[PDB]
Amino acid sequence: MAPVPVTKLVCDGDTYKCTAYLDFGDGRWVAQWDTNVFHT
Amino acid sequence: MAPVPVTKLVCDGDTYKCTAYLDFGDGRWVAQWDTNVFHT
Amino acid sequence: MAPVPVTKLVCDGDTYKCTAYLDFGDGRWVAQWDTNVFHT
Numbered sequence A, B, C: 001m002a003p004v005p006v007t008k009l010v011c012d013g014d015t016y017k018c019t020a021y022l023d024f025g026d027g028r029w030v031a032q033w034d035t036n037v038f039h040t
């Protein structure tokens, strides 16, 4: 399938990005998106 | 609760979207957001 | 590491946000991003 599974998910409050490691190809592809990060 | 759990998470480097399958209602609802996708 | 693991992921179709609970600090930090939500 064109969509591929996420194997690990992390987020970073310095860069304000979340990064999803993908099961695809050689294993070195990620998805990454902007995000808010805050303390509740 | 208004927030509902994600059951499966996939991302697509053709559409540049990630899709989260949700545990809600009939099971056919998703969350989907734009994302970057790249090789590290 | 600057990126930290997500422990739980939820999405909300009233607020159109997904929220990732993070393993960081006191445990009360989240990442949150805008998202589409729809029925397939």
Ligand SMILES: CC(=O)N[C@@H]1[C@@H](O)[C@H](O[C@@H]2O[C@H](CO)[C@@H](O[C@@H]3O[C@H](CO[C@H]4O[C@H](CO)[C@@H](O)[C@H](O)[C@@H]4O[C@@H]4O[C@H](CO)[C@@H](O[C@@H]5O[C@H](CO)[C@H](O)[C@H](O)[C@H]5O)[C@H](O)[C@H]4NC(C)=O)[C@@H](O)[C@H](O[C@H]4O[C@H](CO)[C@@H](O)[C@H](O)[C@@H]4O[C@@H]4O[C@H](CO)[C@@H](O)[C@H](O)[C@H]4NC(C)=O)[C@@H]3O)[C@H](O)[C@H]2NC(C)=O)[C@@H](CO[C@@H]2O[C@@H](C)[C@@H](O)[C@@H](O)[C@@H]2O)O[C@H]1N=[N+]=[N-]
Residues within 6 Å of the ligand: A011, A012, A013, A014, A015, A016, A034, A035, A036, A037, A038, C001, C002, C003, C004, C022, C024, C025, C026, C029, C032, C033, C034
């Ligand atoms: C003791 C200790 O260490 N304690 C820990 C804390 O330090 C740590 O908190 C982090 O601390 C960082 C350092 O203080 C701090 O970094 C600063 O952040 C400032 C604010 O950043 C916001 O505004 C800027 C500019 O507008 C944006 O670029 C940022 O992205 C951010 O904006 C946010 O962006 C996201 C993504 O786009 C938005 O998200 C969207 O939200 C909407 C809804 O609103 C939807 O949901 C969307 O879907 C979603 O995507 C957010 O809305 C938005 N939020 C806001 C309020 O706008 C920066 O301004 C600041 O940058 C300056 O300083 C650095 C160096 O320090 C320079 O490199 C930069 O260039 C810049 O320098 C300035 O440059 C200008 C001009 O260029 C100049 O005029 C100035 O004078 C310069 N100033 C200086 C000082 O040089 C800097 O980056 C972090 O913000 C802060 N993080 C958080 C989350 O609070 C906390 C948290 O730890 C972090 O998170 C955890 C989870 C871990 O990952 C951890 O490792 C990480 O550190 O932990 C404390 N420890 N504890 N407990």
Ligand SMILES: CC(=O)N[C@@H]1[C@@H](O)[C@H](O[C@@H]2O[C@H](CO)[C@@H](O[C@@H]3O[C@H](CO[C@H]4O[C@H](CO)[C@@H](O)[C@H](O)[C@@H]4O[C@@H]4O[C@H](CO)[C@@H](O[C@@H]5O[C@H](CO)[C@H](O)[C@H](O)[C@H]5O)[C@H](O)[C@H]4NC(C)=O)[C@@H](O)[C@H](O[C@H]4O[C@H](CO)[C@@H](O)[C@H](O)[C@@H]4O[C@@H]4O[C@H](CO)[C@@H](O)[C@H](O)[C@H]4NC(C)=O)[C@@H]3O)[C@H](O)[C@H]2NC(C)=O)[C@@H](CO[C@@H]2O[C@@H](C)[C@@H](O)[C@@H](O)[C@@H]2O)O[C@H]1N=[N+]=[N-]
Residues within 6 Å of the ligand: A001, A002, A003, A004, A022, A024, A025, A026, A029, A032, A033, A034, B011, B012, B013, B014, B015, B016, B034, B035, B036, B037, B038
């Ligand atoms: C052999 C093999 O198959 N190898 C595999 C590779 O093929 C595969 O890589 C994919 O290859 C695709 C085909 O080459 C390629 O598609 C093209 O992509 C071009 C670039 O797309 C970017 O720009 C366009 C336009 O600006 C945007 O629409 C796209 O969304 C994308 O922009 C990105 O968008 C995201 C989301 O908004 C941004 O994300 C944000 O980032 C910020 C920070 O920057 C924050 O984090 C935000 O939170 C975050 O959301 C990105 O920043 C941004 N990036 C950039 C750089 O801007 C398209 O331009 C191109 O489209 C043209 O061609 C198609 C048909 O081919 C037409 O349908 C389109 O209409 C368009 O046609 C053109 O139309 C114009 C005018 O309308 C005309 O003038 C032109 O002449 C027309 N040209 C043609 C040719 O017709 C096309 O879609 C993929 O980009 C490429 N993917 C990646 C990730 O590199 C790789 C990867 O595989 C993919 O990913 C994996 C994970 C799996 O899902 C897999 O199934 C999937 O295929 O794998 C190789 N195999 N291996 N290993």
Ligand SMILES: CC(=O)N[C@@H]1[C@@H](O)[C@H](O[C@@H]2O[C@H](CO)[C@@H](O[C@@H]3O[C@H](CO[C@H]4O[C@H](CO)[C@@H](O)[C@H](O)[C@@H]4O[C@@H]4O[C@H](CO)[C@@H](O[C@@H]5O[C@H](CO)[C@H](O)[C@H](O)[C@H]5O)[C@H](O)[C@H]4NC(C)=O)[C@@H](O)[C@H](O[C@H]4O[C@H](CO)[C@@H](O)[C@H](O)[C@@H]4O[C@@H]4O[C@H](CO)[C@@H](O)[C@H](O)[C@H]4NC(C)=O)[C@@H]3O)[C@H](O)[C@H]2NC(C)=O)[C@@H](CO[C@@H]2O[C@@H](C)[C@@H](O)[C@@H](O)[C@@H]2O)O[C@H]1N=[N+]=[N-]
Residues within 6 Å of the ligand: B001, B002, B003, B004, B022, B024, B025, B026, B029, B032, B033, B034, C011, C012, C013, C014, C015, C016, C034, C035, C036, C037, C038
């Ligand atoms: C019986 C039952 O209960 N059934 C259940 C359904 O109720 C439930 O569906 C939810 O129902 C809600 C109530 O009807 C409904 O709320 C309304 O939504 C309207 C539409 O909201 C869209 O447009 C507005 C404005 O433009 C935006 O603010 C919203 O964010 C949203 O836009 C979307 O935003 C996201 C994020 O930015 C976009 O995402 C991006 O997408 C792009 C691609 O497009 C990329 O992927 C990006 O990465 C991604 O981020 C979307 O694209 C975008 N979509 C669109 C189409 O634009 C609101 O307009 C409406 O607000 C009015 O009413 C409320 C009160 O009701 C007021 O508080 C507001 O202020 C506002 O009031 C109006 O104010 C104006 C001026 O200020 C005034 O002129 C008007 O007269 C006022 N009107 C009123 C009536 O007062 C309101 O919020 C939900 O939309 C609907 N949700 C969905 C998903 O369909 C469903 C689903 O349940 C939900 O989801 C699940 C998963 C669970 O979480 C659940 O708990 C939750 O309820 O379930 C049914 N049950 N079943 N099965």
